[PDB]
């Protein structure tokens, strides 16, 4: 398992803030989008498998990775909508073209599914894993972390995330089967070393999860994009994980019903890239080669 980040960090100023990203190679874009509490670092052992198959792009969400922190920060910042505002502006600035393959995880999947739904004629295929695909109930959520996530979604969330860094220190390793090396963990810790508001994105994200009907605007968003995913003939690559975390049970059955979908099942909990990068990267490469073939 490689420890070095992939590529060279690049930056653009987007809506007053510097956003960091990786952009390597030529061709049609293959866009990798991380979620909480990760960064483009999550994709470092996956991206090499796509070399020569396209222009490999991986952005760091606002407040995350090497991207700037918002200021002043507080409970009203880093909502889904704000995250979308920055990311969608960065993707526009990058001139991705009209044959995009998205490779999505966690909140990256909500953002990327929303983008694809809004730009259907520009997306060639979507690979996704451990993704937000439907409004949830607590029963859908991994038992081990129901209490923690409820905690984030209460006034206890500030000390949990801001002071104790629980998403980074506990949730992340808890949903990887292997033990990360110190070096790898320290890349994940890097954006969040300072206690306080630098950790806000890691709190705002769980507060946006669509669970038992709330928040209503994110439930609505997910219902809109999933209605399109269910009916579209756009090619899909569903990377299922065993035991998995957020795509299990009935949600796994639901996703399996979607059309024009290639499936794999690999070992992993939530951060599956850390347990099965070779399988995942190979699957994505195979999927993209089929798309290129079919495009002549």
- Which window, 55-63, 154-162, 178-186, 199-207, contacts Cl ion (CB under 5 A)? 199-207
86 binds Cl ion (CB under 5 A): no
Q: What sign for the dihedral angle of Cα 95, 98, 99, 104?
A: positive
* H helix and E strand count, the chain: 11, 8
Per CB under 5 A, contacts with Cl ion among 19-78 are: 36
Q: What per-residue string of b and e applies to 58-90 under the rule 16 or more CB within 10 Å gives b?
A: bbbbbbbbbbbbbeebeeebbbbebbbebbbbb
206 binds Cl ion (CB under 5 A): yes
Give the pair of three-digit tokens for residue 266.
């690999």
Q: What sign for the dihedral angle of Cα 201, 73, 216, 104?
A: negative
**Shortest gap between Cβ of 6 and Cl ion (angstroms)?**
24
**Shortest gap between Cβ of 53 and Cl ion (angstroms)?**
30
36 vs 165, beta carbon nearer Cl ion: 36
Whether residue 275 lies in the annotated active site: no
Q: How far apart are CA 112 and CA 228, in angstroms?
A: 13
**Shortest gap between Cβ of 209 and Cl ion (angstroms)?**
6
Whether residue 212 lies in the annotated active site: no
Whether residue 105 lies in the annotated active site: no
115 vs 205, beta carbon nearer Cl ion: 205
In degrees and rounded to multiples of 5, residue 101 shows phi and psi of -110, 125
141 vs 205, beta carbon nearer Cl ion: 205
**Shortest gap between Cβ of 166 and Cl ion (angstroms)?**
12
Q: Among 6, 41, 205, 271, indicate the residue that binds Cl ion (CB under 5 A).
A: 205
DSSP state letter for 55: E
**Chain residues in the site for Cl ion (CB under 5 A):** 36, 205-206
Catalytic positions are: 106, 130, 270
């Amino acid at each position: 398992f490689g420890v070095e980040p992939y590529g060279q960090p690049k930056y653009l100023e987007i809506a007053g803030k510097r956003m960091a990203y990786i952009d390597e190679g030529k061709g049609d874009a293959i866009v990798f989008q991380h979620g909480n509490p990760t960064s483009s670092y999550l994709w470092r052992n996956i991206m090499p498998h796509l070399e020569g198959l396209g222009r490999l792009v991986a952005c760091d969400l606002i407040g995350m990775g090497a991207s700037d922190k918002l200021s002043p920060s507080g409970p009203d910042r880093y909502s889904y909508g704000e995250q979308r505002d920055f990311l969608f502006a960065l993707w526009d600035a990058l001139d991705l073209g009209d044959h995009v393959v998205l490779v999505l995880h966690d909140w990256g999947s909500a953002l990327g599914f929303d983008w694809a739904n809004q730009h259907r004629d520009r997306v060639q295929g979507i690979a996704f894993m451990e993704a937000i695909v439907t409004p949830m109930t607590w029963a859908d959520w991994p038992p081990a972390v129901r209490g923690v996530f409820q905690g984030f979604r209460s006034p206890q969330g500030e000390p949990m995330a801001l002071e104790h860094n629980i998403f980074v220190e506990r949730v992340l390793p808890g949903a990887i089967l292997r033990q990360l090396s110190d070096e790898e963990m320290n890349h994940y810790r890097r954006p969040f070393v300072n206690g306080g508001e630098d950790r806000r994105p890691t709190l705002s994200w769980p507060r946006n999860l669509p669970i038992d009907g709330e928040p209503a605007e994110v439930v609505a968003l997910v219902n809109e994009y999933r209605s399109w995913l269910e009916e579209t003939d756009m090619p899909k690559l569903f990377i299922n994980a065993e035991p998995g975390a957020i795509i299990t049970g009935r949600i796994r059955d639901y996703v399996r019903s979607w059309p024009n979908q290639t499936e794999i099942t690999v070992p992993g909990v939530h951060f599956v890239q850390e347990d099965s990068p070779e399988e995942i990267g190979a699957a994505i490469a195979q999927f993209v080669r089929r798309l290129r073939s079919a495009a002549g």
